[PDB]
Amino acid sequence: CPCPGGSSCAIVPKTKEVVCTHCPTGTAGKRCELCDDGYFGDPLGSNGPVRLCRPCQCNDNIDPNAVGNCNRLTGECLKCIYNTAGFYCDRCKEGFFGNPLAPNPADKCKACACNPYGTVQQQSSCNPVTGQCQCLPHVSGRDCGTCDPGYYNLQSGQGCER
Amino acid sequence: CPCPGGSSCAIVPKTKEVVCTHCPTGTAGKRCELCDDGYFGDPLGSNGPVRLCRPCQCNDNIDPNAVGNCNRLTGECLKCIYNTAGFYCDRCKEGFFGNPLAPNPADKCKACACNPYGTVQQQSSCNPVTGQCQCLPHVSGRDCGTCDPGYYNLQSGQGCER
Amino acid sequence: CPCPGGSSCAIVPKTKEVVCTHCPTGTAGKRCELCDDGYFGDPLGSNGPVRLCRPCQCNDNIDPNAVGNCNRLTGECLKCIYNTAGFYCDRCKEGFFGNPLAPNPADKCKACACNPYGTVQQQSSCNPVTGQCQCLPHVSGRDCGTCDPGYYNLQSGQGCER
Amino acid sequence: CPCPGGSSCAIVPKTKEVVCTHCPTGTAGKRCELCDDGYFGDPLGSNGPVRLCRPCQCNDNIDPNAVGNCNRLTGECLKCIYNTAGFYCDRCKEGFFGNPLAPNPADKCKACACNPYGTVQQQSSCNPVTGQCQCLPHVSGRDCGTCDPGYYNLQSGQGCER
Which residues form the Laminin EGF-like domain (chains A, B, C, D)? Predict the structure, then answer.
């Protein structure tokens, strides 16, 4: 059998070709040349040096029971949860802010929720760490949703006036 | 239905009791009061404050396709792979050394392999970072497997002599 | 000069010995054979293979402005702050509980504060994750500080009685 | 003294204004309203909620002995070393590839070194994980520096020909 240590093989009938069957854990493919789902690397050096298959590294921000969580070759996370994003689920989705590495799911990424009347050009994204939205003149609040004390007419859509 | 948002329920016949069926993702149990496998927390505050279920945090040193990787309540990792160990797969098994957080599986934890003739009291464990074994007099090497230059008789089991 | 690339040296007068002076960043010592404070490794392979000096890895739980934060050879963290502890400031001090890796200093490690009247054998340590103290009969609360509903006399020091 | 617990203060002569002097560790400023260098947060809630000052979180890819390693308000890493980059020194500089989180400084980020004759449009950047450069027709190698077996003339600057 043209398969790694442990792998048994089978002569398929539907085309008459041999394929590996008990590929070592972490690898898959007809020759156990691919990494299994949930893993990434290049077990047989098919595309560069040999890279042992290892579990995806997505800062624990992926569903353990989902499939296709990461690119089997590069390790790029594909199914980041909790509104996280980035190559390794280490950023927040655009329009969100917080700390993707915060251990409690609720504290990872919260929506910017920028008030459209007070935010410059009605932007939907805010500072990624503080969440501060970019406010029009004399508007205040993280979401730019209220006028500064003594100013009025937020709905002017151009800042508050005295 | 006495179940969280989304969960449907079913009146079982075999005892005539209702149980939840479409528990929100991450939770499980007849009332979706437990965290699903691969997750940990306390969704309904059954044993302390409410703790949203989150994927186990085992420094990516657990098989994504195994079950029971961590304690569903505390998050303690139970099935650490690559010879890693510790509460969160952040140490190496006893008798191993290296860096459990090293990204390549081969560089995480290697066996001490202390030479029994040169190691003090025939110990099997070595320094967890350097891997240095504790050597008898005039013995050298990480594994204490050879005499210092000019000394002889390692098999004396008491160090080399001149 | 018997010193690495860049290092200049000086013939000291007080004993008449040469010593290196502009050791490359991260290293120190008369021959730049040690790693500088805040770093760990073995730049010249003086005690095993060459290990480039790198900043201590203490999960950001060390004072950036303190000295001696980690062992210059092994990297073992020595001055863990915020009540954190363990080889790499990845555990909580004994008698504390929480998540040493929690990003907010206040959420890392909190004191067990076990009530001495309700805790078994007056223990001071609690579960490292939940903080639950070990309670005597019919005593409840994380700190074991109150009787179960309908029980009395916590100060009995043996659990509450009906 | 208009200063936090522990801080003493001084009436300066050069303008006659009081300023705090023994600010609690991690904070600084005339009112201990700023986080000290090497730290980030908002101790007194001067720009949003109170955020305890904590050491910069730059994946240990910053010089412990440098100043201004991170933004005192947001925590954005400013002086990433070892060719690392990104908000938290968690990417590699452009034109580099590897794993910024690799514990050995040498394995973090290596230069793409794309061969200009074999790389498409003479690009200098390569795949961030594999380092593979984008090669012209019939050119091979990570750096696109040699022709496929049986092809010739790499210096054509358009791929090799048979």
Answer: 1-55, 56-111, 112-162
